[PDB]
Amino acid sequence: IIETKMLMGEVMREAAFSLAEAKFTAGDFSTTVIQNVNKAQVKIRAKKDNVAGVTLPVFEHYHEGTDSYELTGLARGGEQLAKLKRNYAKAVELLVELA
Amino acid sequence: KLIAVIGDEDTVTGFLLGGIGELNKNRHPNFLVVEKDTTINEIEDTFRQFLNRDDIGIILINQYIAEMVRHALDAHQRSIPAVLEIPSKEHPYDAAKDSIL
Amino acid sequence: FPELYFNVDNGYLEGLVRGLKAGVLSQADYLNLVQCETLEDLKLHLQSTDYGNFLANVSVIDDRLKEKMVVEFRHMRNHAYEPLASFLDFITYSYMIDNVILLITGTLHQRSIAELVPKCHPLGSFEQMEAVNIAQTPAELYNAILVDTPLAAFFQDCISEQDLDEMNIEIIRNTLYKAYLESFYKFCTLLGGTTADAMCPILEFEADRRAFIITINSFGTELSKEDRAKLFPHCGRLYPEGLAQLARADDYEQVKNVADYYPEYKLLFEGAKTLEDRFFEHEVKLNKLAFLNQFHFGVFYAFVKLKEQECRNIVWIAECIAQRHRAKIDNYIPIF
């Protein structure tokens, strides 16, 4: 927990730096992305670990179903976006392991 | 079986873009943006709103925002759902929920 | 011949926007803001320039900068008579289009007009034509309200029943921007002379950014090659031939070799600074060139697209300072 809760502090500093690499180029992503969301893309599956005979809850990464911001930007930006996705799909990949 | 996020303005636009948001028009949205003029009660009920929901697995919240609702998350002493404290662009992760030891 | 007039009506406003050109931060002005280390020191150097005493009362730097270029733009539109007041209205249509797609989303999801005032660009705004403020009807009885707005003639490629979720939210912006760029080219062709050779080269490259950035992001998407064909503006240098080969692309190098037929757009594909940082420096190279010609209307549109670069650059300086990541702080656009 100690070695990875400081490690996400660098990743959430690196990925949120890409938010400056982000709408500075392409407008403002503060109303477009918060108005056309219906379903989730990355979900959780509750698996079961075990140590010393004690059942243990563990969360498993599960990305499925569709894209929702597939068409966002696309005329200005869109390369500063969708690497912001990769900076925040890797960040949510680490944060479900820590959860 | 999805992820919830409180975060901030610049936090929630990155994690929705990550693909964790879900709009349930029946119950509630699974996120809550906090601006400069959001009351602490609105963060307080939505923390209880996410805690009472069965499908919420993680509750992401910035510690800079979770510092004022620290008294409510110190009353949550269950295992599921897990509350996580993420750094902001000001005052990163220092002293939250490693204080049990 | 069309130069011994135009000072009857637009004599004073021309010298005004040339005076506001001198308030643009120069190269030496850019260097001292890199040497800053906190946002309070960022406030001190900006008081030395023309912006001064605007932070007397890091995301507040975003709003307090762009609110200054709105009131400077609104003050210019209050004095242009008839040869220019429609021209400044054409610059606001790019902001009205980004506003109205933001509005049909909350209309579709039953999110009312209370979110309109704080979450829209003040340049293209709705503080007149009060029918749009009342409308909560789900996007079919609101299109009948939408035609009491100067974006009506651009909706002639927007069928009202096509709006109801058969078209994607992003697609309707580009085919409205396609209808916008054809009209503003034809309006700038009706005006002749100095405003027809200093402005239309800017609109050709602006239509060719919408040629390249569309097809370079339309690869993994499930929109077919006939969809990205009609989302290209039929305006620029690529019209009869380059628009045809961009439809059959399917690959990053297949949009590069069609840009190799033009020596202007090649040597800009050597970003390999990224591509949009290379398209931006050529765009401000064209807007700076419009400031050479004197007796023409293109000095106003070149001012707004450079004033949005001023509000862009100071924030990028501030974001490298507040997040303390000033190893990429030199990746701004030095316009002057």
UniProtKB/Swiss-Prot annotation, chain B:
Superkingdom, taxonomy of origin: Eukaryota
Any one GO MF annotation of this record: proton-transporting ATPase activity, rotational mechanism
Membrane topology designation: Peripheral membrane protein
Major site of localization recorded for this protein: membrane
GO biological process annotation, one example: proton transmembrane transport
Keyword Lipid metabolism (UniProt): no
Keyword terms: Cytoplasmic vesicle, Hydrogen ion transport, Ion transport, Membrane, Synapse, Transport
Distribution of this protein across tissues and organs: Expressed in brain (at protein level).
GO cellular component terms attached to this protein's record: clathrin-coated vesicle membrane; membrane; synaptic vesicle membrane; vacuolar proton-transporting V-type ATPase, V1 domain
Compartments where found: Cytoplasmic vesicle, Secretory vesicle, Synaptic vesicle membrane; Cytoplasmic vesicle, Clathrin-coated vesicle membrane
Function (record text): Subunit of the V1 complex of vacuolar(H+)-ATPase (V-ATPase), a multisubunit enzyme composed of a peripheral complex (V1) that hydrolyzes ATP and a membrane integral complex (V0) that translocates protons. V-ATPase is responsible for acidifying and maintaining the pH of intracellular compartments and in some cell types, is targeted to the plasma membrane, where it is responsible for acidifying the extracellular environment.
Family in the record: Belongs to the V-ATPase F subunit family.
Quaternary assembly: V-ATPase is a heteromultimeric enzyme made up of two complexes: the ATP-hydrolytic V1 complex and the proton translocation V0 complex. The V1 complex consists of three catalytic AB heterodimers that form a heterohexamer, three peripheral stalks each consisting of EG heterodimers, one central rotor including subunits D and F, and the regulatory subunits C and H. The proton translocation complex V0 consists of the proton transport subunit a, a ring of proteolipid subunits c9c'', rotary subunit d, subunits e and f, and the accessory subunits ATP6AP1/Ac45 and ATP6AP2/PRR.
Protein known as: V-type proton ATPase subunit F
Native source organism of the sequence: Bos taurus
Top-level taxonomy: Eukaryota, Metazoa, Chordata, Craniata, Vertebrata
Full-length numbering of the shown residues: 6 to 106 of 119
Swiss-Prot record, chain C:
Keyword Transport found: yes
First-listed, main subcellular location of the protein, grouped into a coarse class: membrane
Modified residues (Phosphotyrosine): 261
One annotated Gene Ontology cellular component of this protein: vacuolar proton-transporting V-type ATPase, V0 domain
GO molecular function: proton-transporting ATPase activity, rotational mechanism
Domain of life per record: Eukaryota
Membrane topology label: Peripheral membrane protein
Modification after translation, per record: The N-terminus is blocked.
Subcellular location(s) per record: Membrane; Lysosome membrane; Cytoplasmic vesicle, Clathrin-coated vesicle membrane
UniProt GO BP: cellular response to increased oxygen levels; cilium assembly; intracellular iron ion homeostasis; pH reduction; proton transmembrane transport; vacuolar acidification; vacuolar transport
UniProtKB keywords: Cilium biogenesis/degradation, Cytoplasmic vesicle, Hydrogen ion transport, Ion transport, Lysosome, Membrane, Phosphoprotein, Transport
Tissue spec: Expressed in brain (at protein level).
InterPro entries: ATPase_csu/dsu_sf, ATPase_V0-cplx_csu/dsu, ATPase_V0-cplx_dsu, V-type_ATPase_csu/dsu, V-type_ATPase_csu/dsu_dom_3
Keyword Metal-binding belongs to the record: no
Description of how the protein assembles with itself and partners: V-ATPase is a heteromultimeric enzyme made up of two complexes: the ATP-hydrolytic V1 complex and the proton translocation V0 complex. The V1 complex consists of three catalytic AB heterodimers that form a heterohexamer, three peripheral stalks each consisting of EG heterodimers, one central rotor including subunits D and F, and the regulatory subunits C and H. The proton translocation complex V0 consists of the proton transport subunit a, a ring of proteolipid subunits c9c'', rotary subunit d, subunits e and f, and the accessory subunits ATP6AP1/Ac45 and ATP6AP2/PRR.
Cited function: Subunit of the V0 complex of vacuolar(H+)-ATPase (V-ATPase), a multisubunit enzyme composed of a peripheral complex (V1) that hydrolyzes ATP and a membrane integral complex (V0) that translocates protons. V-ATPase is responsible for acidifying and maintaining the pH of intracellular compartments and in some cell types, is targeted to the plasma membrane, where it is responsible for acidifying the extracellular environment. May play a role in coupling of proton transport and ATP hydrolysis.
Membership in a protein family: Belongs to the V-ATPase V0D/AC39 subunit family.
Name of the featured protein: V-type proton ATPase subunit d 1
Species assigned in the record: Bos taurus
